[PDB]
Amino acid sequence: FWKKIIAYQQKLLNYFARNFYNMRMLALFVAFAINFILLFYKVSTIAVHYVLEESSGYMEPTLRILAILHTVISFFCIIGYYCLKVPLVIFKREKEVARKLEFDGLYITEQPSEDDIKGQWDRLVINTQSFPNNYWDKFVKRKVMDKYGEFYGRDRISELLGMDKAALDFSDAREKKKPKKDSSLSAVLNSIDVKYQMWKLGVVFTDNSFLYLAWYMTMSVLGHYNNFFFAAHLLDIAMGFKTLRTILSSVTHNGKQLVLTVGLLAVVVYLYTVVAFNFFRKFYNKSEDGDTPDMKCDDMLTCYMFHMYVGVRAGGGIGDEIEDPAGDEYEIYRIIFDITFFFFVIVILLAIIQGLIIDAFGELRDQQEQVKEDMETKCFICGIGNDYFDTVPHGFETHTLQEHNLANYLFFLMYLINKDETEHTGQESYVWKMYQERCWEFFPAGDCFRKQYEDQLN
């Protein structure tokens, strides 16, 4: 019975994992439909009331159905990606922590910097009996024992890795094993590794994409209390469409420079505000009636807000909005003030922003062109130029599609991993040993079959 409930749960997990992406698209479509409906949403006026104004009259139930559907789809888009992308994240982190144990002595000789959330949290998974649950290397604990026990102590490293000392020897001497039935009560509760699940949940909660999906679900829930919270789901186009991401990378490529340019603009406008407050106060009267003046630069804060909010947005600068200087003793000084403000703030800094965006476009295009040129002129593995192979017609294509194919190397790694170690050939054992040692000298570098047998082949 339990073996059947597990099968049904696995079927549901597989369904959601398969349909994760399609349903993200469905959520985006439903959000767009909800916002299109909301475009016909008026206010009635006492406390004002928000009401749909439509001749058809039936998009209120349509909106309610769409909101319920969006919430359901968001929940399902959490369950999916939990069935699909969480295993990959867990695998990656397990691989990283295992290799930092083996090749760096992270928790043996180094210890985390005490400010790294990942390093501090990963201390829990070491002691778990199911540490490499997703990572293939199930012998990482034994390898760490072999590498570090002889200097840092068998017993202490075994305590660090949560391994048993005398139980293995006693079982070898006498098996002394009794059968267990998982259908019995508390059997699953005893089988599940509580500490490992703790660490896994911590990793999932720290994952950024899962947090984004949780925020999406929370906004969908809030959309039922207020239908305008569904507008927040229109921001999902950035993370849903690849094509929009080039345009958005044009902005985010130099985002730090953009922020620094805004800060520099703020500083320059503050300097202009100081000058105006010290010398040009009388020109900042923004009241048409002389009975009650409205002086905008009688205070530092008000004058700075006036500048930042009005002069920057003005086409000709602050002079477009402050009093005319003709006939005044400070006419030349205020003319210089206005002209310099217009040149430095309106003309130059905004030009800096435009140039940052244009340069981001150009830099991304150049990076793509560089990738294309490198891939077309050099082999990805050995790095030999294309001309040497092109001495033979179609030589580079043949070499990169038949001899040094990175897809073929990936397939070989998969074949070695899935193949039994006892069934390895000599070459397979050699490559497997260097792979476990993480020595990449078996990858050809500057040499190939053609180069080494150039005399005999040609």
């Binding site: 929940f75 949290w121 009560l185 703790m198 911590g202 909660f205 899962f210």
Partner: protein
């Protein structure tokens, strides 16, 4: 070389935030598992002992809903601790 020698001559002879986040994680996940790591699960499953695909799917959804609520509590606790260490 000159500036190196001069420097040698003149040379003569976050944690709170990460700790709060770790504590919030541990506390919230412990609260989440305190309702899944006890023996009352038998007396709750006595009602769902029948096959009832509908109830199996309901429980399957409820587990993920509980996980999501635990994350919401964790985020709230993180914000509370971050404001407390601000103040």
């Amino acid at each position: 070389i000159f500036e190196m020698q001069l420097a040698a001559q003149i040379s003569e002879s976050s944690i709170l935030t990460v700790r709060s986040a770790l504590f919030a994680l541990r506390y919230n996940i412990l609260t989440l598992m305190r309702m899944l790591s006890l023996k009352s699960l038998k007396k709750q499953m006595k009602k769902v002992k029948k096959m009832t695909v509908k109830d199996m799917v309901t429980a399957f959804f409820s587990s993920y809903w509980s996980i999501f609520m635990t994350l919401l509590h964790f985020v709230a606790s993180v914000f509370r601790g971050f404001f407390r260490i601000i103040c």
